[PDB]
Amino acid sequence: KLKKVLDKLRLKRKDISEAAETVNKVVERLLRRMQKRESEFKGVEQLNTGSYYEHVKISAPNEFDVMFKLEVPRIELQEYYETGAFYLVKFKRIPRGNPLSHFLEGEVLSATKMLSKFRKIIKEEVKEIKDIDVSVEKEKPGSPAVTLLIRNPEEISVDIILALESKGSWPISTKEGLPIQGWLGTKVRTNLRREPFYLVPKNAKDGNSFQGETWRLSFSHTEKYILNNHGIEKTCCESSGAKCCRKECLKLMKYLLEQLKKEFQELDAFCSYHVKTAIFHMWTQDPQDSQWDPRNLSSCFDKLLAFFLECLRTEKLDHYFIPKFNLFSQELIDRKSKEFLSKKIEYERNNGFPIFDKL
Amino acid sequence: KLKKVLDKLRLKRKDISEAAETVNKVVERLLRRMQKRESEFKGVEQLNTGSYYEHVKISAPNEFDVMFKLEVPRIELQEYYETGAFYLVKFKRIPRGNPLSHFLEGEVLSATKMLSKFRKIIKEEVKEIKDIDVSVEKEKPGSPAVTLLIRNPEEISVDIILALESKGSWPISTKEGLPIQGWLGTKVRTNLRREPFYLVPKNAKDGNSFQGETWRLSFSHTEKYILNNHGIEKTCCESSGAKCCRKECLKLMKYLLEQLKKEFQELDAFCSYHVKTAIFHMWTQDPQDSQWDPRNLSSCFDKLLAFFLECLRTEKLDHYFIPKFNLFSQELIDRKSKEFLSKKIEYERNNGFPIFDKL
DNA sequence: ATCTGTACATGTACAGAT
DNA sequence: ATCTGTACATGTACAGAT
DNA sequence: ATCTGTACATGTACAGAT
DNA sequence: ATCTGTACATGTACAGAT
Ligand SMILES: [Zn+2]
Ligand SMILES: [Zn+2]
After folding, report:
1. Least CB–CB distance from A238: residue in B186, B229, B240
2. Among A187, A213, B75, B147, which residue carries the largest CB count within 10 Å?
3. Beta-strand runs (E) in chain A
4. In this structure, are A174 and A304 located in the same domain?
């Protein structure tokens, strides 16, 4: 039933190759510029993240998420109003001049300055790329990235996310986060939290206090690992194991939301990370791989639908790494929007998903 | 039944504490001496291996296995005629004078010499410790280890194993080894084979050719990982998962073999490694954790037992990492020994294992 | 002379195409 | 199925630095 | 660069429940 | 017997400091 939809969201090798050539050229160039010659971002490191590198990119290879992560050693971290996700970054005992001293704002490290210099260097280097049609997208509020528009005949979007890497232990609001013990295990969880944690610019433009100095936690790496190692059995989806319908369900969900969101302006507040969080919670609820047999697809998909409905109705969706962070708060999303989405999803659900047959 | 046997085979944390304290003391001192007083074994590192660190040690914490591994770069391996497991170690371009100069017989690295020096150093440092009752065991032919006898009242043995470390790709005799694809998976296997391989002195005194220049592959690190990561499910034997009886069956099997070897001299060619290999192949045949339920212990045990008999019947126990290397070959164990053991095994098997019930 | 950094080699999982 | 491109891990060459 | 503070796995020991 | 919860113990990773 949903097989043909998946066969339609399935990417094509020609498109993947054609896009990745160009994307890799550009990104490598920027990485060089930022790293090689004298930047404040020297030593910055690449980390490919997002749907394309998690193998859950649908329809087209037209979105690439790339992290330029920079390690900031002695870093004092201060939570922003018990939010869980938002922090302020101070420098402990800076011994010398410090390559980020121009980005200091009062006493704290400024995300806005840093991101502006970052953006300036990217623009300058992009100007010199003569073999590819590439421009820089206008700054979007909320965005932690410098977005590039590539015309490789087709339109490809590339988010260059500026990140701060901390190698220390994760914030204490992540303690009860990442509930994968009865699913991926305790050794996997223990080894994952030994990885560094990341910080992106919040880049909110509401004018509120601090604002330009406020950072947000990122775990795109942990999520990438989880997407690549998703079974309770190590051989899941491997060449000597059984395929599950997890990633496919994720795809179907993301697609439904994409179609809906491009048909209705009332869904502007919603994004694919909401459904990603939701499917994490569904995987924690149903750890067993047999609960995700391609046998059904229909049933597990419908179950995900159901859970996300409930998330909407209760106006709750805890961050999978920060459980005191509701992504479906009234603060973030109005209940009118959520009920609207609820209605749309319900219609599509008990009407045989006609929107999948659209565009 | 077998549960009571497992109860008496279980170690006591008091004995564990008392033994480990002293063992760690001595080991640390020897390691320090090794890395410090400017030896050719400077830069040697420690790797704990064996039943104790696999939590498969039975009865008493009276045996400890420690590898002193030395990273030896730029080695050329020359197989000892189609054995798969045995090699001569030459050097590509013999780098500096290199600390291993005097251990070289032209191009080939002498094992007997390097081990003789290793041993001499260890003896000199064992002489110089007066707060522990520790001596050095007489050299066993065939043994790659300088063995220490600690008479911290209860006799403890410590094998200090001289290992060469190599970070290249594993020898091609291992290409078809480690058949864990359907059990632990392809990523686990690939990762484990990204790890270094080790070479220990064969140290036979048979008098034959290449006697003191022959090295042997060791995979004790890989085995350790496998033992502590034994399930098809990642939650196997974790706090939020279900237990299995894998390690238990290994323990019982090891115990049966120990008792039989304790009684009969006709079994001197047999070691716990035959058992370990056998159960590796068993776990590979039965990948499911539910094929190893603690409620089916007996039937699991007997199962392994039967397999062992077949390995005895067909005179074939393929090494788990080097398939072309037969452990039960005529060259290694006389047919008569391999019939004696089968007879004793069947006997104990049909009569309720009376040998378990005695000391 | 040797040492270091860059980036070319090499091997395989994932998933597309047939 | 087999074949196959990409992404990512590690190993290793060698120019150029000391 | 050698040494050291935090974190949690794996395991034993024993009592209270079932 | 069987199970389970808490106490208790060793081993191992590793960032970061000196
Ligand atoms: Zn799967
Ligand atoms: Zn287990």
Report:
1. B186
2. A213
3. 45-49, 63-71, 75-79, 86-91, 104-105, 108-109, 133-136, 145-152, 154-166, 197-201, 214-218
4. yes
Are both A161 and A300 inside the same structural domain?
A: no
Resolution in A: 2.5
* DSSP per-residue codes, A149-204: EEEESEEEEEEEEEEEEE-SPPPTTSTT----TTTT-HHHHHHHTTS-EEEEE---
Task: Determine whether the interchain pair B232/A233 forms a contact, defined as Cβ–Cβ distance below 8 Å.
Answer: yes
Residues A155 and A176 in one domain: no
Q: Do the annotations mark residue A244 as ligand-binding?
A: yes
List the domain range (segments joined by +) for residue A333.
1-11+170-196+219-359
Please give the structure tokens belonging to residue A36: 């090689």
Give the nearest chain B residue to A233 (CA atoms).
B233
How close, in Å, is residue A187 to chain B by CA atoms? 8
Residue B14 neighbours by CB distance under 10 Å: 9
Q: Which of A218, A248, A282 finishes a domain? A: A218
Residue numbers in A near B242 (CB within 8 A): none
Q: Are B337 and B224 contained in the same domain?
A: yes
* Residue B120: CB less than 7 A from any atom in strand D: no
Number of structural domains chain A divides into: 2
Q: Per-residue b/e over B136-168, b at no fewer than 16 CB within 10 Å?
A: beeeeeebbbbbbebebeeebebbbbbbbbbee
Q: Do A50 and A142 lie in a common domain?
A: yes
Q: Are residues A230 and A295 in the same domain?
A: yes
- Is residue A326 within 8 A of residue A84, CB to CB? The reply is no
Grouping H, G, I as helix, E, B as strand and the rest as coil, residue A289 is helix
How far, in Å, CA of B137 to CA of B159, rounded?
10
Q: Six-digit token pair at B190?
A: 């690939």
Residue A355: give its domain's CATH number. Answer: 1.10.1410.40
A333 C-beta neighbours (distance < 10 Å), count: 19
Orientation angle between helical segments A272-285 and A246-263, nearest 10 degrees: 150
Do A178 and A318 belong together in one domain? yes
CATH code of A57's domain: 3.30.460.90
CB contacts, 8 Å: A239 with chain B: 181, 186
Which technique?
X-ray
Q: Considering B184, B218, B252, which residue would you say is the last residue of a domain?
A: B218
Distance B231 CA to ligand 1 centre (A): 17
Q: Do both B331 and B191 map to the same domain? A: yes
| Phi, psi at B330, each rounded to 5° | -60, -35
Footprint of strand F on the protein (CB under 7 A): A 73-74, 92, 166-168, 194; B 3, 13, 16-17, 20-21, 23-24, 48, 53
If contacts are CB pairs under 8 Å, which of residues 2-61 in chain A contact chain B? Answer: none
Q: What is the C-alpha to C-alpha distance for residues A87 and A213, in angstroms, rounded to an integer?
A: 9
